[PDB]
Amino acid sequence: QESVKEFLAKAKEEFLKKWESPSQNTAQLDHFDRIKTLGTGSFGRVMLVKHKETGNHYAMKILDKQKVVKLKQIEHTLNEKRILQAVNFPFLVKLEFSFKDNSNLYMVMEYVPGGEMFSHLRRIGRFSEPHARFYAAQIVLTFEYLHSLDLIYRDLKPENLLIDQQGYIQVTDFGFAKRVKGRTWTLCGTPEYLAPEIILSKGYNKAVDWWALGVLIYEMAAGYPPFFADQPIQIYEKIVSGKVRFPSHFSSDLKDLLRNLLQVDLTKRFGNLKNGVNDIKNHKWFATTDWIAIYQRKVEAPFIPKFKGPGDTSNFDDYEEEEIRVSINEKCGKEFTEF
Numbered sequence: 001q002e003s004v005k006e007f008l009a010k011a012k013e014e015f016l017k018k019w020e021s022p023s024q025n026t027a028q029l030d031h032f033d034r035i036k037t038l039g040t041g042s043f044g045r046v047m048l049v050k051h052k053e054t055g056n057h058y059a060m061k062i063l064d065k066q067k068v069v070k071l072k073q074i075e076h077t078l079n080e081k082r083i084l085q086a087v088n089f090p091f092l093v094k095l096e097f098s099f100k101d102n103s104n105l106y107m108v109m110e111y112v113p114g115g116e117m118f119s120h121l122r123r124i125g126r127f128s129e130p131h132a133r134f135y136a137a138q139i140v141l142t143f144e145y146l147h148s149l150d151l152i153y154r155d156l157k158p159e160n161l162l163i164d165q166q167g168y169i170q171v172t173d174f175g176f177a178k179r180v181k182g183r184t185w186t187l188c189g190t191p192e193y194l195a196p197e198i199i200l201s202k203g204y205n206k207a208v209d210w211w212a213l214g215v216l217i218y219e220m221a222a223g224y225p226p227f228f229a230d231q232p233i234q235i236y237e238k239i240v241s242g243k244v245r246f247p248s249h250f251s252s253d254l255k256d257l258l259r260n261l262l263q264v265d266l267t268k269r270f271g272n273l274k275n276g277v278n279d280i281k282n283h284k285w286f287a288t289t290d291w292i293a294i295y296q297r298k299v300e301a302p303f304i305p306k307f308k309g310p311g312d313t314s315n316f317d318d319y320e321e322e323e324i325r326v327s328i329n330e331k332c333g334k335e336f337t338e339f
Contacts, residue, residue, distance in 0.1 A: 008144075008145070008148045011088075011089075011145060011148065011149070012148060012149055014088065015086050015087060015088075015149050016086075018085060018086035019082065019083075019086040019179070022081075022082050022085050022086065022338075023085050023098065024098065024099075024339070025098075025099050025100075026097045026098060026099065027097035027098075027099050027106075027108060028099055028101075029099070029101060029106065029324075029326070031051060031052060031053070032049040032050060032051055032052065032058070032060065032108075033049060033050045033052055034047060034049055034324070035047070035048040035049060035050055035057075035311070035313070036048045036313050036316075036321075037319040037320075037321055037322070038059060038313070038316045038319075039316070039317075039319070040319050042067065042071060043063055043064055043067035043068050043070075043071050043073060044061060044062050044063040044064060044067075044068075044104075045061075045062050045319075045322075046059055046060065046061050046062075047059070047060045047062060047324075048060075048111060048311070048313060048316075049108070050311070056310075057111045057310050057311050058096060058097075058108045058109060058110065058111050059093075059108075059109045059110070059111045059112070059172075060106060060107070060108045060109075061106070061107040061108075061109065062104050062105070062106055062324060063077055063104060063105040063106075063107075064103065064104055065100075065103060065104060065105060065331050065332040065335070065336060066103075066331055066332060068105070068332075069332055069335060073175075074335050074336075076175055076176060076178075076186075076188070077105060077175070077336075077339070078336070078338055078339060079174070079177060079178050079179070080107070080174040080175050080176075080177060081095075081098055081105070081107060081339055082338075083151060083174050083177050083178075083179065084107065084109075084174050084177075085098065087145075087146075087149070087151075089141075089142060089145045089146075090168070090295065090297060091138045091139075091141065091142045091168065091169050091170060091171055092142065092170065092171050093109050093110055093112070093162070093170045093171065093172045094109065094110045095107055095108070095109050096108050096109060096110065098339070100336060100339050101326050102326055102327045102328070102329060102330045102331060103325060103326045103327045103331055104324070104326065105336060105339055109172065110170070111310065112162035112163070112164050112170050112172075113165070113305070113307040113309075113310060113311075113312045113313070113315060114162060114163040114164055114165065114167075114304075114305030114307060114315055115162065115163060115305060115315025115316055116158065116159050116160075116161065116162055116163075116315075116316075117135070117158040117159075117161040117162070117163060117169070118157075118158035118159040118161075119315060119317075120163060120303070120305070121158055121219070121220060121223070125223050126220070126221060126222055126223035127220045127221060127302070128221075128302075129221055129250075129251060129254060129285075130288075130302060131220075131302040131303065132217055132220035132221045133285065133286065133288070133289065134294075134299065134301065134302055135161070135169055135220060136213065136216070136217050136220070136286075137286065137289050137291065137294045138168065138169045138294060139156070139161075139169070139171075139213055139216065140213070140277065140280055140281060140286075141291065141294065141295055142169075142171060143206075143209050143210070143213070143271070143277070144277045146177075146209075147206045147209070147277075149179070150179055150180060150181050151177055151178065151179055151180075152177065152178050152180060152184065152205070152206050152208065152209060153171075153174075153176070153177050153209050153212075154176035154177060154178065154188060154189055154208065154209070155173055155174075155175060155176045155177070155188075155189055155190070155193075156193060156209060156212035156213060156215075156216055157190050157192075157193050157212075157216070158216070158219065158220075159173075160172055160173040163303070163305050165304070165305075165307075166297060166301060166304070167301025167302065167303050167304045167305070168297055168301060176188045176189060180205075182203075182205065183203030183204060183205050184203070184204065184205070185201075185202075185203055185204070187201070189208075189212075191232045191235045191236065192215065192219075192225045192227060192228065192235060193211075193212045193215045193216075193225075194208075194212075194236070194239060195207065195208040195211035195212065195239075195266070196211075196239055196240045196264050196266075197266050199236045199239055199240060200240065204266070205266075205272070206271070206272070207266045207269050207271060207272035208266075209271070210261055210269055210270060210271030210272060210280075211261060211262065211263075211266075211269065213261055213271075214226075214257075214258050214260075214261025214262040215227075215262070217254070217257070217258060217261070218244075218258055218262070221247075221250060221254060222247050222250075226238075226244045226245075226258075226262065227239045227244075240264065241264075242264045244258070244259075244262055246258070251285070253283070253284045253285040253287075254285055256283075256284070256285070257270070257280075257283050257284075257285040257286075260279070260283075261280075270283075
């Protein structure tokens with residue numbers, strides 16, 4: 001255990017140094033060629049770009065400052081960039097550059113051509129338990145790392161997990177990640193993945209990430225999430241009820257772990273007890289997991305995505321290609337001074 005303790009102490013030291021003195025303004029837009037839109041949202045988009053001098057490909061997240069303000073995401077976007085530039089773990093995507101202009105904020109990250117877990121899971125239908133367990137182990141270690149830094153992730157779902165060339169996970173999208181000691185209160189995240197204490201407007205803590213892991217494991221192994229309905233309010237009723245139904249093909253060990261992660265009483269939920277993450281790591285469902293070998297990326301992956309090279313976009317979907325407009329006048333300068 002001393003080995004883990006010393007690893008996490010060094011991790012916190014290195015995170016805090018970058019957290020206290022964040023990088024800023026480390027590239028500009030005209031250093032890149034635009035290739036393709038990879039995803040779109042209410043206040044931004046993600047683009048495949050190529051750096052004109054090195055030839056390297058990157059995923060560039062572009063946020064419209066005016067829409068960020070309207071949709072009340074200012075603090076969240078400042079969190080996202082400050083955290084991402086400060087972390088370092090094998091299963092977290094690396095932020096390579098950031099900058100802003102009159103209209104937009106930009107985060108330039110490593111490009112992962114294998115695509116999102118969401119697409120692979122819907123294509124295959126459901127993952128076997130070994131396959132789901134390989135991914136789950138990476139999330140457990142990633143949350144052990146993040147939580148030790150007093151970070152809550154708050155957006156675990158298959159769309160945010162990219163599959164790399166070795167078949168390992170890269171967590172992307174830190175839009176709701178926050179540094180907090182103790183409780184926080186914001187309603188955010190995707191309905192199917194919300195813990196009961198979020199739905200009920202409580203002051204909640206890192207236990208919500210462990211709940212979301214239970215939802216993820218269930219969805220990976222079943223092919224659909226445990227709480228599903230046409231309207232968010234119907235989903236929320238199922239989440240708070242304390243009732244889940246398991247497919248008969250689930251192993252007994254999987255059901256037992258899920259009852260302890262999908263525990264409605266946050267004071268009894270695995271990951272939030274006196275024994276912390278070890279209640280999860282030592283559970284029978286993980287008995288075949290060599291935690292060190294997973295961290296070192298020495299385990300042969302269940303699945304290697306098919307792709308032709310570092311610029312291949314075949315595992316991403318097609319979107320309308322819209323302009324990236326940069327106003328002649330500065331927008332929202334004060335709000336985003338620290339970015």
